Amino acid sequence: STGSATTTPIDSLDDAYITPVQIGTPAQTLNLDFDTGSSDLWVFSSETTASEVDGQTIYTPSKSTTAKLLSGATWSISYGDGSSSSGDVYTDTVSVGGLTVTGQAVESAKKVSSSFTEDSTIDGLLGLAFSTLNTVSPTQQKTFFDNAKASLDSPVFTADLGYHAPGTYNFGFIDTTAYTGSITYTAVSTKQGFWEWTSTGYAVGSGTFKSTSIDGIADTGTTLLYLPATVVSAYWAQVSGAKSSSSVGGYVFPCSATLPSFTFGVGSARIVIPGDYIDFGPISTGSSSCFGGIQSSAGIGINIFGDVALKAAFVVFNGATTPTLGFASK
Ligand SMILES: COc1ccnc(NN)n1
């Protein structure tokens, strides 16, 4: 089997992407944030505290003839941006782009933090990291991909995120028309539960490539590219007037600037992020200070190849017995 679904930016600056997901019988379609940095499929629901729902589409398990309470199971998750959610668990039929999994754990939110309530465009998350990170207790549950894997034509999924435009998540096949050149594959460590890999270096604009190992994660659920402070300083030094602002929370730059590209290495291959991809717009409406798309990871503990980086590539998440990542230009 295969599946293919379009993913659409939630807003004008690609803060996140939403993909329609069919849950239950008859189908209830929710728009979920596919997140290769986490491993829970959770949804706003008829159980979510009413004051914490503001415009989201909810899953109502009592209206699904295939829903079953997973007795005793609870979940609770916190994300790198400080947001969180928690609740109980049903199993139900879940379909993405024509690919169907029966008995998928659908984690129903009883509580969500304010940032979720305040974002009416995201109805939940669909985790695509390794199932070792799934938070369901006392019986850990498998991700949608883990459940689908054995049925897929090939045990892979691909992320093809658009810049200010829709893109595609495919399951079970590589679309050889979706990229240019060749796909360069690179080793993955699953020891932290992430799609963790080592970039071979970087360049700023037309500058020379610096060969240096940068361990980080391929994370579709993170908006920005978070890299070591040395790398980030080297980038923003090429933008007149750019500076790190503690009050704003990162590097800002004059909105009048033209940003240089940023290149990252994948083995001997190179992925070029155009400068425009690094612009996240005025820090507040009407400001002439703009919030940068490359930020320091120093306070995180891990480097994160988020959407800024991934949207410059066609990315293969190869879930074979020994997982690997592939990157191609497009
Ligand atoms: C994409 O993250 C952020 C954070 C803060 N400000 C902005 N854009 N003005 N983007």
XYZ file of C-alpha atoms and ligand atoms in Angstrom:
340
model
C 0.000 0.000 0.000
C 0.854 3.682 -0.258
C -0.578 7.008 0.802
C -0.120 10.572 -0.414
C -1.463 13.708 1.254
C -0.982 17.407 0.659
C 0.382 19.460 3.537
C -0.484 23.158 3.688
C 1.141 26.040 5.605
C -1.116 27.171 8.530
C -0.202 30.860 7.953
C 1.725 33.317 5.660
C 5.166 32.648 7.204
C 4.967 28.754 7.337
C 4.917 28.531 11.174
C 3.649 25.008 10.625
C 1.978 22.726 8.111
C -1.333 20.886 8.408
C -2.311 17.655 6.688
C -5.875 16.262 6.621
C -6.330 12.964 8.478
C -9.457 10.785 8.503
C -10.285 9.336 11.933
C -13.118 6.967 12.738
C -16.209 5.646 11.018
C -17.769 7.602 9.413
C -14.596 9.601 8.877
C -13.957 12.684 10.959
C -11.360 14.759 9.121
C -8.953 16.694 11.338
C -6.012 18.807 10.193
C -2.937 17.537 12.022
C 0.630 18.776 12.325
C 2.854 15.921 11.137
C 5.820 15.980 13.509
C 8.941 13.889 12.887
C 10.200 15.101 16.288
C 7.536 13.390 18.423
C 5.658 10.108 18.552
C 2.095 10.764 19.759
C -0.990 11.101 17.565
C -3.215 13.349 19.655
C -6.313 15.355 18.824
C -8.633 17.990 20.111
C -11.747 16.093 21.084
C -15.181 16.124 22.642
C -13.273 15.478 25.913
C -11.130 18.612 25.692
C -11.896 21.175 28.399
C -14.390 23.447 26.665
C -12.602 26.710 27.518
C -9.447 25.321 25.862
C -11.151 24.797 22.475
C -11.331 27.865 20.240
C -12.102 27.032 16.616
C -10.411 23.648 16.255
C -12.190 20.691 14.737
C -12.700 17.999 17.362
C -12.742 14.215 17.285
C -15.849 12.761 18.956
C -15.170 9.066 19.628
C -18.794 8.385 20.601
C -19.768 9.157 16.981
C -17.276 6.631 15.565
C -18.516 3.063 15.350
C -14.909 1.814 15.243
C -13.637 3.738 18.287
C -12.768 1.775 21.414
C -11.539 3.198 24.705
C -8.051 1.892 25.450
C -8.871 1.113 29.046
C -6.588 2.652 31.650
C -4.338 4.382 29.138
C -3.323 8.000 29.619
C -0.839 10.283 27.908
C 0.947 13.540 28.650
C 3.461 15.334 26.457
C 5.570 18.485 26.572
C 7.172 19.986 23.481
C 10.376 21.931 22.967
C 8.462 25.214 22.732
C 7.025 24.727 26.223
C 3.555 23.686 25.057
C 1.850 20.570 26.376
C -1.256 18.413 26.265
C -2.630 15.314 27.991
C -5.619 12.993 28.092
C -6.880 9.461 27.519
C -6.689 7.090 24.563
C -8.933 5.409 22.018
C -8.088 3.037 19.231
C -9.712 3.798 15.897
C -9.220 3.633 12.158
C -6.928 6.361 10.840
C -6.306 7.134 7.177
C -3.786 9.512 5.600
C -3.877 10.164 1.895
C -5.594 6.847 1.187
C -3.405 4.728 3.522
C -5.456 3.142 6.314
C -4.351 1.815 9.703
C -6.843 -0.005 11.899
C -6.402 0.003 15.658
C -4.314 3.185 15.724
C -3.941 4.810 19.130
C -5.720 8.164 18.936
C -4.824 10.183 22.011
C -7.786 12.340 22.997
C -6.862 15.589 24.715
C -8.546 16.450 27.972
C -6.178 19.406 28.471
C -4.084 21.486 26.079
C -1.812 24.421 26.830
C -2.613 27.956 25.763
C -0.580 27.964 22.556
C -2.673 25.079 21.208
C -5.957 26.756 22.164
C -4.801 29.990 20.545
C -4.022 28.295 17.210
C -7.337 27.440 15.602
C -5.677 25.895 12.522
C -4.077 22.845 14.198
C -6.453 20.110 15.383
C -3.692 17.916 16.836
C -0.351 16.292 16.077
C 0.639 13.139 14.224
C 4.018 11.994 15.497
C 6.492 10.404 13.095
C 9.554 9.967 15.333
C 10.357 6.536 16.780
C 7.717 4.807 18.872
C 10.116 4.627 21.844
C 9.137 8.281 22.500
C 5.389 7.624 22.648
C 4.021 8.853 25.983
C 1.045 6.510 26.467
C 1.084 4.775 29.852
C 1.076 2.041 31.037
C 1.294 0.477 27.549
C 3.321 2.491 25.050
C 1.675 2.805 21.636
C 3.001 2.774 18.080
C 3.048 5.669 15.645
C 0.918 5.697 12.518
C 4.033 4.974 10.446
C 5.110 2.082 12.676
C 1.636 0.550 12.377
C 1.510 1.051 8.600
C 5.091 0.033 7.855
C 4.589 -3.677 7.221
C 1.793 -2.981 4.724
C 3.663 -0.314 2.781
C 5.267 -1.067 -0.564
C 8.530 0.227 0.953
C 9.045 1.117 4.657
C 9.524 4.822 4.037
C 7.803 8.151 4.163
C 8.852 11.388 2.487
C 8.447 15.037 3.409
C 8.298 17.613 0.610
C 7.424 20.849 2.366
C 6.682 23.957 0.323
C 8.014 27.472 0.728
C 4.941 29.645 1.142
C 3.051 26.907 -0.714
C 1.577 23.439 -0.151
C 3.699 20.320 -0.275
C 3.333 16.572 0.134
C 3.766 13.723 2.608
C 4.025 10.351 0.882
C 3.994 6.942 2.572
C 5.414 3.785 1.060
C 7.073 5.117 -2.089
C 9.605 7.592 -3.425
C 8.206 9.977 -6.027
C 11.160 10.228 -8.407
C 9.539 13.233 -10.133
C 9.556 15.312 -6.932
C 13.278 16.117 -6.745
C 16.250 16.984 -8.927
C 19.523 15.112 -9.112
C 20.061 12.219 -6.721
C 19.059 11.513 -3.129
C 22.012 11.366 -0.733
C 21.420 9.019 2.177
C 23.034 9.460 5.575
C 23.156 7.440 8.787
C 20.602 7.826 11.574
C 20.938 7.256 15.304
C 17.689 6.263 17.009
C 19.242 6.344 20.487
C 17.245 9.443 21.500
C 14.118 8.390 19.586
C 14.642 10.996 16.848
C 15.671 11.011 13.199
C 19.128 12.086 14.345
C 21.904 12.493 11.789
C 25.185 14.353 11.269
C 25.507 17.126 8.715
C 28.953 17.488 7.158
C 29.132 21.292 7.369
C 27.792 24.583 6.134
C 28.331 27.663 4.021
C 26.950 31.188 4.315
C 25.894 32.770 1.035
C 28.588 32.396 -1.609
C 31.229 31.757 1.056
C 33.466 28.738 1.314
C 32.075 25.520 2.746
C 33.182 24.760 6.310
C 33.582 21.030 6.850
C 32.426 20.278 10.379
C 30.179 17.626 11.906
C 26.825 18.960 13.123
C 24.661 16.369 14.868
C 20.978 17.224 14.802
C 17.450 15.999 14.205
C 15.190 16.200 11.162
C 12.080 17.714 12.775
C 9.069 18.708 10.667
C 7.303 19.923 13.818
C 9.851 22.676 14.503
C 9.577 25.803 12.522
C 13.181 27.033 12.580
C 16.693 25.903 11.965
C 18.530 25.688 15.310
C 22.311 25.324 15.055
C 25.391 25.904 17.224
C 26.016 29.487 18.256
C 29.245 29.664 16.232
C 27.424 28.734 12.998
C 24.515 31.078 13.680
C 26.836 34.000 14.478
C 28.715 33.390 11.226
C 25.431 33.556 9.297
C 24.027 36.715 10.875
C 27.386 38.503 10.682
C 26.700 38.675 6.925
C 23.475 40.683 7.473
C 24.089 44.361 8.245
C 22.360 45.360 11.440
C 21.429 41.836 12.533
C 21.862 41.111 16.224
C 20.766 38.702 18.909
C 18.014 40.239 21.037
C 17.454 38.720 24.466
C 14.137 40.577 24.788
C 12.789 39.275 21.485
C 14.279 35.812 21.993
C 16.759 35.419 19.158
C 18.425 36.982 16.170
C 16.553 39.822 14.518
C 17.493 41.751 11.420
C 16.363 44.876 9.563
C 13.369 44.087 7.410
C 15.086 46.073 4.614
C 17.883 43.495 4.396
C 18.379 40.950 1.642
C 19.307 37.699 3.392
C 22.084 35.397 2.162
C 21.448 31.740 1.529
C 22.592 29.037 3.941
C 23.976 25.712 2.727
C 24.167 22.532 4.788
C 26.040 19.363 3.936
C 24.581 15.882 3.581
C 27.585 13.680 2.972
C 29.286 15.158 -0.074
C 26.003 16.737 -1.221
C 24.792 20.248 -0.441
C 21.303 21.596 0.285
C 20.897 25.338 -0.288
C 18.337 27.244 1.784
C 17.527 30.474 -0.113
C 17.792 33.657 1.909
C 14.068 34.354 1.623
C 13.328 31.117 3.521
C 15.125 32.627 6.542
C 12.794 35.654 6.844
C 9.960 35.132 9.534
C 8.741 38.751 9.256
C 8.243 41.845 11.488
C 8.617 40.861 15.235
C 5.274 42.586 15.843
C 2.858 44.104 13.365
C 4.331 47.182 11.708
C 7.844 46.689 13.095
C 10.881 47.102 10.854
C 12.739 44.471 12.894
C 12.291 40.992 11.444
C 12.686 37.591 13.287
C 15.425 35.299 11.777
C 14.850 31.735 10.646
C 18.260 30.481 11.801
C 18.653 30.583 15.575
C 21.026 29.247 18.192
C 20.442 25.799 19.675
C 22.640 26.626 22.679
C 19.683 26.604 25.094
C 18.047 23.477 23.618
C 20.611 20.705 24.017
C 20.221 19.494 20.426
C 20.512 20.971 16.961
C 17.254 20.948 15.014
C 16.869 20.840 11.240
C 13.337 22.206 11.302
C 11.088 23.347 8.491
C 13.444 26.154 7.333
C 15.985 23.485 6.385
C 13.667 20.640 5.411
C 11.543 22.723 3.021
C 14.657 23.296 0.893
C 14.855 19.539 0.263
C 12.987 16.400 -0.636
C 13.511 14.320 2.506
C 13.281 10.520 2.771
C 12.616 9.012 6.202
C 13.736 5.428 5.584
C 12.318 3.157 8.287
C 14.090 -0.011 7.212
C 15.554 -2.232 9.940
C 18.495 0.174 10.046
C 16.887 3.583 9.456
C 18.510 6.237 7.284
C 17.647 9.733 6.027
C 17.840 10.883 2.425
C 18.058 14.437 1.115
C 17.696 15.711 -2.443
C 17.493 19.169 -3.915
C 14.241 20.055 -5.660
C 9.082 31.569 13.646
O 9.312 31.993 14.990
C 9.138 33.297 15.267
C 9.379 33.700 16.577
C 9.181 35.045 16.799
N 8.792 35.909 15.858
C 8.586 35.384 14.645
N 8.188 36.206 13.644
N 8.001 37.595 13.812
N 8.746 34.103 14.292
